[PDB]
From Swiss-Prot, chain A:
Protein name, as recorded: Large ribosomal subunit protein uL3
Post-translational modification: Methylation at His-242 by HPM1 is required for proper 60S subunit assembly and promotes translational elongation fidelity.
Record-level GO cellular component terms: cytoplasm; cytosol; cytosolic large ribosomal subunit
Remarks, miscellaneous: Present with 450 molecules/cell in log phase SD medium.
Cross-link (Glycyl lysine isopeptide (Lys-Gly) (interchain with G-Cter in ubiquitin)) at residue(s): K38, K135
Organism: Saccharomyces cerevisiae (strain ATCC 204508 / S288c)
GO aspect biological process, one term: cytoplasmic translation
Record carries keyword Cytoplasm: yes
Function statement: Component of the ribosome, a large ribonucleoprotein complex responsible for the synthesis of proteins in the cell. The small ribosomal subunit (SSU) binds messenger RNAs (mRNAs) and translates the encoded message by selecting cognate aminoacyl-transfer RNA (tRNA) molecules. The large subunit (LSU) contains the ribosomal catalytic site termed the peptidyl transferase center (PTC), which catalyzes the formation of peptide bonds, thereby polymerizing the amino acids delivered by tRNAs into a polypeptide chain.
GO molecular function terms attached to this record: RNA binding; structural constituent of ribosome
Domain of life: Eukaryota
A Pfam family annotated for this UniProt entry: Ribosomal_L3
UniProtKB/Swiss-Prot annotation, chain B:
Source species, domain of life: Eukaryota
Example GO BP: cytoplasmic translation
Predominant localisation class: cytoplasm
Protein name per the record: Large ribosomal subunit protein eL24A
Residues modified as Phosphoserine: S7
GO MF term (any one): mRNA binding
Assembly and interaction partners: Component of the large ribosomal subunit (LSU). Mature yeast ribosomes consist of a small (40S) and a large (60S) subunit. The 40S small subunit contains 1 molecule of ribosomal RNA (18S rRNA) and 33 different proteins (encoded by 57 genes). The large 60S subunit contains 3 rRNA molecules (25S, 5.8S and 5S rRNA) and 46 different proteins (encoded by 81 genes).
From-to range in the entire protein, with total length: 1 to 68 of 155
Curated annotation (Swiss-Prot), chain C:
Protein name (database record): Large ribosomal subunit protein uL14A
KW DNA-binding (keyword) present: no
General function of this protein: Component of the ribosome, a large ribonucleoprotein complex responsible for the synthesis of proteins in the cell. The small ribosomal subunit (SSU) binds messenger RNAs (mRNAs) and translates the encoded message by selecting cognate aminoacyl-transfer RNA (tRNA) molecules. The large subunit (LSU) contains the ribosomal catalytic site termed the peptidyl transferase center (PTC), which catalyzes the formation of peptide bonds, thereby polymerizing the amino acids delivered by tRNAs into a polypeptide chain.
Self-association and partners: Component of the large ribosomal subunit (LSU). Mature yeast ribosomes consist of a small (40S) and a large (60S) subunit. The 40S small subunit contains 1 molecule of ribosomal RNA (18S rRNA) and 33 different proteins (encoded by 57 genes). The large 60S subunit contains 3 rRNA molecules (25S, 5.8S and 5S rRNA) and 46 different proteins (encoded by 81 genes).
Keywords on record: Acetylation, Cytoplasm, Methylation, Ribonucleoprotein, Ribosomal protein
InterPro entries documented for this protein: Ribosomal_uL14, Ribosomal_uL14_CS, Ribosomal_uL14_sf
Cysteines joined through disulfide linkages: none
Length: 386, 68, 134
RNA sequence: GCAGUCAAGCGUUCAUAGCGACAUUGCUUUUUGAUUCUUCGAUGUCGGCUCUUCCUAUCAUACCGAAGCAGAAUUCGGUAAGCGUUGGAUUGUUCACCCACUAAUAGGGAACGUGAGCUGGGUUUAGACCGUCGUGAGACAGGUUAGUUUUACCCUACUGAUGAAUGUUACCGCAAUAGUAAUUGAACUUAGUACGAGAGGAACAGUUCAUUCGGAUAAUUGGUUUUUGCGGCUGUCUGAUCAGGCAUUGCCGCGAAGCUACCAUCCGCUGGAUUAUGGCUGAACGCCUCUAAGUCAGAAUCCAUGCUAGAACGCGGUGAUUU
RNA sequence: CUCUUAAGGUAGCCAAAUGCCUCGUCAUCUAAUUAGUGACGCGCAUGAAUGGAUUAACGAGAUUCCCACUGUCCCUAUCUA
RNA sequence: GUGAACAGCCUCUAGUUGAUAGAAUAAUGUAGAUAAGGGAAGUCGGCAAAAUAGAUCCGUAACUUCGGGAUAAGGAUUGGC
């Protein structure tokens, strides 16, 4: 009856229902708009969140107080071993949508994706793709038939790829498979490229570069059944309340004689699929390089791995990306990294970053040192030693 | 970038990995952590804090270097 | 208004009701906050000031001609820590402000103690009388 | 209460920029009344708190038009309810009045929303005091103080969580439909420019920041501590010593991990059609006319893009299918 | 000076637990007070054992202010049974 | 035993170890706690909670029925050997 003091709505309604996601692997509901006047390249990637750290770099923002001055920004690390391509998928356009007509596989699939196709691998006969691998045993008549069908039809093309989870220190012997859109000219060229890359690997170095803005797609950290106050940011009721204060007091008016969809109730917090945009890449690094954690100024030979490892993940013995800011999901979650769907000109996408130093001190406590050599030099000899 | 030092042991501080305090005159104090920062508030003496530099180098501990 | 430029987000420690030292010579001891100047609105949220902020305030102890009235003040020292873009977390010991007409000119002639670079860069006439800074 | 009409007059001249007497037609039902149809084998009967939605007769933000509009500031009016619309002193208060910040501090509804949501200050039981009245009992929208606020395990609704039936099982997808969130200001510069006699005094673009809202994250900073992790301290018991028990976690400092904070950080899209309105060509009317045909631009609006779920009876693709 | 009736509120006291008009008026406390305190008192309707005024001390009485204090609150969060 | 003390806390004697249990550690709860900056802005209203708290020394106002007020306020010390 005219709320005596107007204030705004608690929570966002366009992120409903805040239910548990169907999978840990979030769906890509959109890919970048295709430009068919360029080569064939991936529009997105799959990685695993390793953790976070802090970065020093010099600012290039004129008019700002801190132009040509250093700042201290945080970054998330995503370990990204090379992704291997095992399939090609063709979608044709209908008045009901883009519809998958067929999907072609490679001859030799690894036992990781083969593991994905099973729920009990240790006991099973592993007879998934045997009769398919035998279709290859001829010249590939039907295989080229299918590829030609795709060439004829197939408005769009998606590549089935999977991860080398065995290279990450997780114990998840079963890899993550995904469809990735191609955004390059000549569907013919796409499928020939794909066929060339069957059984073959593809690295982030070819797909991403410095200063490119990307979207991040992951599953938010789950928190189970949670109360309305932290799930929605509702005001706590006073101390004097009978029957709870971590509640909503007025759940609805008499008429409409119903509880509305828009009122804050209790339920699932976390484990939502969320798509976060405009995270800048600050480094595209290589596990081959012992000096991943090094910098042009930081000529100390050091990998990105902190002292004692990334907490709850492990060490990085593969390639990686340290990307600005914060990314949905907790450590060990499969993240889908998509290149942005729009041309940025904010001068924040246009600011070329040159790193200056990387924190590689232990995150399992208040780390004060960056290397054990530094530690040994500063402290000296211990009761143990020689 | 500079690596300042704890104002209560002399322990190194990379950026962000500590808090700063300014006393009511101007005297600045860099602390690596709540630990040293709290010891400061408790009005404490590193020359008694067995594990700080200011103790170890009062006691001539570990150096073995000035005669090399 | 009356300040030379902008300011970054900075952590809040002085709501209305709080009381801080008049770190100038103008003749007051305290400075009683009543209102922040920018301070957009929200239900049952209190306008919180910060370092370098202009406010409106009164005196509770000082000269008798200096009390029982409203006037604009400016914060210079904040015990509630904040962060600058250089990652440093810092904080003074106390809450200290001074007095000024709205335009950015002090009534006092001088200042007693350290001051933040933000208020310095943002309020020159203060920045002139300003002794040591940070 | 609110909106219209005619125009006598104001408006220096000028009814109609703005107003508008005498009169007059209407709207609403958030005022208060009139009624007494419903409920007296009972609907919990002030106000506050919290929360959502809705309305426009729009306070501000957007695009506009007009002005006795030079500029600035202001006023009148249109589309618009997309987003917002505060903090405190006194009072039980609604209301009312003050202080102050603000772009603005617009008004109203939903059983005068909301008591198995809270409170119980007020009214409105029993106790007690005063005043006035009454011979007296006792009374008084006259004052004052103290005065038990119950039940959900059910149905629906909502929130989130399962799941049968489709040949089985596994993997990848489509996306019907439903929802949607971005907001507002300041500083610099434009520019002491334009404008103006001066007085004073803009705007567009651009740059940097901020507010409100929202979504994630925990590197760092802070907090939290049953890591009962280390140390210390009291009483007492184990003869001592070491080591340890009990003190409803014995207490204190540190206290990582984990969780968390505008008390930390990061992030918050672009195309079309449109309204008002201004115009094009141009008829009707041999002229005129943005309009009738037809047409260009054009808003914080709509639909899309993007965003969340994925129909459990909507679907496709693919692998495998038992001595 | 009178009528009136038996006499006409004396000392004292107050918008007070009594005052309608009432947020009474002045001052003071406040940034701001329908609150409070002190003062005015033609006081609807104060008042002398139907006890008046004042009053140290005491009050699980009612009321205001101040200092300290504090998660009551801005603004919520974490932990244990 | 500690300690002013039959207080609280631990123990000897004697009696008990019995009050449906098990696994998890979600929300909301009951009881309990701690929390940066601020400090009653909340609220009818400081309800609740916090703070102070023992002993010794020091000093201890107004007003007063001269007895008190008063632990006033208000500062400093406490260990072990």
């Amino acid at each position: 009856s005219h709320r005596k003091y107007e204030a705004p709505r608690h929570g966002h309604l366009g992120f409903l229902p805040r239910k548990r996601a169907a999978s840990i692997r979030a769906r890509v509901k959109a890919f970048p708009k295709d430009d068919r006047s360029k080569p064939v390249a991936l529009t997105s990637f799959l990685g695993y969140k390793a953790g976070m750290t802090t970065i020093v770099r010099d600012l290039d923002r004129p008019g700002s107080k801190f132009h040509k001055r250093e700042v201290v920004e945080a970054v998330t690390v995503v370990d990204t071993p090379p992704v291997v391509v095992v399939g090609v998928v063709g979608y044709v356009e209908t008045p009901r949508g883009l519809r998958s007509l067929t999907t072609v596989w490679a001859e030799h699939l690894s036992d990781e994706v083969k593991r994905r196709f099973y729920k009990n691998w240790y006991k099973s006969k592993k007879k998934a793709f045997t009769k398919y691998s035998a279709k290859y045993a001829q010249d590939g008549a039907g295989i080229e038939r299918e590829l030609a069908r795709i060439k004829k039809y197939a408005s769009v093309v998606r590549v089935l790829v999977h991860t080398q989870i065995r290279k990450t220190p997780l114990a998840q012997k079963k890899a993550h498979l995904a469809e990735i859109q191609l955004n390059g000219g000549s569907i013919s060229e796409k499928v020939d490229w794909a066929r060339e890359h069957f059984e073959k690997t593809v690295a982030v170095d070819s797909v991403f570069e410095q200063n490119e803005m990307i979207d991040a797609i992951a599953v938010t950290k789950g928190h189970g059944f949670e109360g309305v106050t932290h799930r929605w940011g509702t005001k706590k009721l006073p101390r004097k309340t009978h029957r709870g204060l971590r509640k909503v007091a007025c759940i609805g008016a008499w008429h409409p004689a119903h509880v509305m969809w828009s009122v804050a109730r209790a339920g699932q917090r976390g484990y939502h699929s969320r798509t976060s945009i405009n995270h800048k890449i600050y480094r595209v690094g290589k596990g081959d390089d012992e000096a991943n954690g090094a910098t042009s100024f930081d000529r100390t030979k050091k990998t990105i791995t902190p002292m004692g490892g990334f907490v709850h993940y492990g060490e990085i013995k593969n390639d990686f990306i340290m990307v600005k800011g914060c990314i949905p999901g907790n450590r060990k979650r499969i993240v889908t990294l998509r290149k942005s769907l729009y041309t940025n000109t904010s001068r924040k996408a246009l600011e070329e970053v040159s790193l200056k130093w990387i924190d590689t001190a232990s995150k399992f406590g208040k780390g004060r040192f960056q290397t054990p050599a530094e530690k040994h030099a500063f402290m000296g000899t211990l009761k143990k030693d020689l | 970038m500079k690596v300042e030092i704890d104002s209560f042991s002399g322990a190194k501080i990379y950026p962000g990995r500590g808090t700063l305090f300014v006393r009511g005159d101007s005297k600045i104090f860099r602390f690596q952590n709540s630990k040293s920062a709290s010891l400061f508030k408790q009005r404490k003496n590193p020359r008694r804090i067995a594990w700080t530099v200011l103790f170890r180098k009062h006691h001539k501990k570990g150096i073995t270097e000035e005669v090399a | 208004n009356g300040a030379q430029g902008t300011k970054f987000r900075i952590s809040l420690g002085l709501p209305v009701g709080a009381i801080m030292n008049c770190a100038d010579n103008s003749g007051a001891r305290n400075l009683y906050i009543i209102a922040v100047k920018g301070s957009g609105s929200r239900l049952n949220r209190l306008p919180a000031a910060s370092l370098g902020d202009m406010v409106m305030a009164t005196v509770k102890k000082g000269k008798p001609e200096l009390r029982k009235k409203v006037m604009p003040a400016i914060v210079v020292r904040q015990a509630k820590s904040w962060r600058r873009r250089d990652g440093v977390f810092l904080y003074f010991e106390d809450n200290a402000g001074v007095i000024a007409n709205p335009k950015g000119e002090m009534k006092g002639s001088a200042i007693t103690g350290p001051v933040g670079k933000e208020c310095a860069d943002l309020w020159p006439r203060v920045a002139s009388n300003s002794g040591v800074v940070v």
